[PDB]
């Protein structure tokens, strides 16, 4: 198989890979109309333009702004690029992601779409995910920076509170050491 990523950039060779995933991590999405909604974006499904309504999670621009300096950022999501592009493009105002990967570059293992993180191309020392659901990295628990659901909550400060540990992590010569393993 052909690597998830191309070469990294000068700038990021030495710098960690950061795998961020999508819904009920930097945002929630839903079918049923929502009031105060960030994004109401239409999404084609079988052949009817269906209204998407997004959330975004407290902190999130702070958040991207941040990570998108510190790492080699990329943007993995289960869902379909139809529907995570346009929030994507929304979201990252500052270029932070590197790179999308959508549901193509999961693997189906075992009923779930599992995001292979030695399939990016990158050291593994050198790797970090962050994803609510565990699922997603069964291949990689030592390579996960833990983080909660979210849907609503907006009194939640994950994000922002999570920006120390990586401001910690960017330092470290193997996250692993950290993370342990
Ligand atoms: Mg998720």
Known sequence: ???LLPEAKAQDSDKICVVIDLDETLVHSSFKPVNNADFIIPVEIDGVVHQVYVLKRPHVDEFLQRMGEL??????????????????????????????????????????????????????????????????????????????????????????????????????????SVLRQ
């Not at 999308?100 to 030695?118: I, P, T």
């Not at 790797?127 to 659901?149: E, G, K, R």
């Not at 920006?163 to 193997?174: M, T």
Request: charged share 25%; glycine share 2%.
């Open 71 to 176: 790492f080699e950022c990329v943007l993995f999501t289960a869902s379909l690029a139809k529907y995570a592009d346009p929030v994507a493009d929304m979201l990252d105002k500052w270029g932070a992601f590197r790179a999308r990967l959508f549901r193509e570059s999961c693997v189906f293992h075992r009923g779930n779409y599992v995001k292979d993180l030695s399939r990016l191309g990158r050291d593994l020392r050198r790797v970090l995910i962050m994803d609510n659901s565990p699922a997603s990295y069964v291949f990689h628990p030592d390579n996960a920076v833990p983080v909660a659901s979210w849907f609503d909550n907006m009194s939640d400060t994950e994000l922002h509170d999570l920006l120390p540990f990586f401001e910690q992590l960017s330092r470290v010569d193997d996250v692993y």
């Open 1 to 3: 198989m052909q690597y």
